[PDB]
Amino acid sequence: AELVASAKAAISQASDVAALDNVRVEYLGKKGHLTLQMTTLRELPPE
């Protein structure tokens, strides 16, 4: 429930009060966050 869901907590909440079709602006901003979070696995045990 830390960052794994905290970034998803700020993602769905940002996609809640979307007036127009601004959900793509949230997607490009959140997919850029989760893709930069895929670089976190550069460390960690390889198994």
Which pair of tokens denotes residue 40? Answer: 């976190």
**Two tokens, residue 10:** 């700020």
Distance CA 7, CA 21 (A): 21
Q: Give the resolution value in Å.
A: 2.1
Contact present, 26 and 3 (Cβ < 8 Å): no
CA 1-3-19 angle, to 5 degrees, is 100
Token duo for residue 30: 């959140």
Residue 19 phi/psi, 5° resolution?
A: -65, -70
* Rounded Cα–Cα distance for residues 10 and 35 (Å): 16
